[PDB]
From a paper:
At the axonal surface, type IIa receptor protein tyrosine phosphatases (RPTPs) (type IIa RPTPs, for example, RPTPσ, RPTPδ and leukocyte common antigen-related (LAR) in vertebrates, dLAR in Drosophila), are a recently identified nexus for extracellular interactions, receiving signals and transmitting them intracellularly to the cytoskeleton to regulate neuronal extension and guidance, as well as synaptic organization. There are two major neuronal RPTPσ isoforms, sharing a common intracellular catalytic region and an extracellular region predicted to contain three immunoglobulin (Ig)-like domains followed by either five or nine fibronectin (FN) type III domains, in the central and peripheral nervous systems, respectively. Previous mutagenesis and structural studies have demonstrated that the proteoglycan-binding site lies on Ig1 of RPTPσ, and comprises an extended positively charged surface of basic residues101314. Binding of postsynaptic TrkC, is reported to require the N-terminal three Ig domains of RPTPσ17; the NGL-3-binding site has been mapped to the FN1-2 domains.
To facilitate crystallization, a chicken TrkC construct (TrkC LRRIg1cryst) was generated, which removed putative sites of N-linked glycosylation and residues 63–77, a predicted disordered loop. A 2.5Å crystal structure of a chicken RPTPσ Ig1–2:TrkC LRRIg1cryst complex was determined, revealing a 1:1 stoichiometry, in agreement with results from multi-angle light scattering (MALS) analysis. The structure is consistent with a trans RPTPσ:TrkC complex spanning the synaptic cleft. The V-shaped RPTPσ Ig1–2 module contacts an extended TrkC surface consisting of the LRR convex face and Ig1 domain, with a buried surface area of 1,093 Å2 per molecule. Three major contact sites constitute the protein–protein interface in the complex crystal structure: site 1, RPTPσ Ig1:TrkC Ig1; site 2, RPTPσ Ig1:TrkC LRRIg1 inter-domain region and site 3, RPTPσ Ig2:TrkC LRR. Electrostatic interactions involving RPTPσ residues R96 and R99 and TrkC residues D240 and D242 dominate interactions at site 1. At site 2, Q75 in RPTPσ, interacts with TrkC residues E287 and Q148, while the side chains of RPTPσ E78 and TrkC R121 form a salt bridge. Site 3 centres on a K203–E100 salt bridge between RPTPσ and TrkC residues, respectively. RPTPσ:TrkC crystal structures provide an explanation for the specificity of this interaction and also highlight an overlap of TrkC and proteoglycan-binding sites on RPTPσ.
Numbering used by the authors:
A (entry chain C): 29 to 67, 72 to 227
B (entry chain A): 29 to 62, 78 to 257, 262 to 304
The structure:
Amino acid sequence: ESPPVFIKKPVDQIGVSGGVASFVCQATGDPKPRVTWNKVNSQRFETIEFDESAGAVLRIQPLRTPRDENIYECVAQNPHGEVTVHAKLTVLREDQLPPGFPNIDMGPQLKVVERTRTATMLCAASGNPDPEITWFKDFLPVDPSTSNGRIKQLRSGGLQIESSEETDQGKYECVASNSAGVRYSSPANLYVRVR
Amino acid sequence: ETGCPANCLCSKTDINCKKPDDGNLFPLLEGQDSRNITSIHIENWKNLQTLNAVDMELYTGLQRLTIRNSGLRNIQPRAFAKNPHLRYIDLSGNRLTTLSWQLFQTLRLFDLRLERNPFQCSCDIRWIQLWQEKGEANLQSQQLHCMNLDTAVILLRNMNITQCDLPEISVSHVNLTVREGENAVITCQGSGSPLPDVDWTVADLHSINTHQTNNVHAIQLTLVNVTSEDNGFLLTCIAENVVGMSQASVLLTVYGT
Ligand SMILES: *[C@@H]1O[C@H](CO)[C@@H](O)[C@H](O)[C@H]1NC(C)=O
Ligand SMILES: *[C@@H]1O[C@H](CO)[C@@H](O)[C@H](O)[C@H]1NC(C)=O
Ligand SMILES: *[C@@H]1O[C@H](CO)[C@@H](O)[C@H](O)[C@H]1NC(C)=O
């Protein structure tokens, strides 16, 4: 028996009007905890659950300003306690973007790989400071450590998937972040074919 | 060697997988022949529980989808966003406990088959009752059932959810004229139970525009430094809940140099 602890705290997001923002929370505990997001029901606000409902992403798309600017709350619960963490959304207009706001120079493309073959999804971005690239698959952050060793994030920013398996199939997007804000590429699907 | 997926039959326009299959992945055709596929028929797939967008997106020419007497429990949001010609959908004989009209918002459906699914009676399927009554997509012909939380099973036509109807909508102005270079403000508001979401679907507007919130959900649209290129633009507002959708519009007129 043990109460809920967040092993993923959501982080503040500064997005662009028309774009995407995501907040991730995930909680551990015994019994396994259940998490939920909070603040009306909208297609533009989507909750994607994971880890048997002990994790959840709140994904907002397309972003609207100023109406979407808010503090969003993720609450985690089990029979030994209830706990909450917060995160802030700012949304800039296209005409308000500072000079070094992350830019996607070339995004991922549609790809088909044969099962067991290696596959690399490409992403290249620029901005100031130099932007940090992370990857999302089926609206979920990709975690290399659970792949495991099988999947690497390259220095160039590509996602390298060795020994392709059926669960590697899905919709990928790369996300470029820096102190100015966050920018999503267009999505690209990776298909895994037989043999 | 064929590209055709195991235990299906393929022609240049059709894919049929009707023999009992234990697999849980949706059948993917291998090749760029995908956009010319107009008909996909799946039946007796007891382990096919979910349908993802990624499975549907290659079949851009699809017109007819049958997933029948299989294990289908749910369909991801926007699964059919890239199948705009899809006008016939059969989901009968599956394990669907609920279904959202939003899956179908971009389609013009002639036939949607929902018989022999274990629906739970809730406000999330009020729309189905409504489509039945207004004769939409041949739902009027079908005998669907749903279950109450006390386990009583009823005909859908006897379902009686209170405080659960179509959203209403209004706008502050019938038309709007503005001088080039100036601002303008207008409001759209939705009402009803449950409370609708409200959006100005106005992305193709060239002028800078901001959306601010104000038992009624109201969004103010601010136009700033308006340009002549938006003259004659129809400013559209939409009001959505789980039951359905209402639309309202304001004609924009821009004069000056
Ligand atoms: C699919 O159909 C289109 C037009 O009908 C044509 O351009 C294309 O070559 C066809 N593809 C195949 C594989 O036959
Ligand atoms: C349905 O029952 C509710 C009370 O639970 C009531 O609001 C409504 O008048 C009833 N309508 C019908 C047709 O039974
Ligand atoms: C407004 O738009 C005009 C025309 O594009 C542009 O040249 C100008 O910089 C803007 N002026 C103001 C006051 O916003």
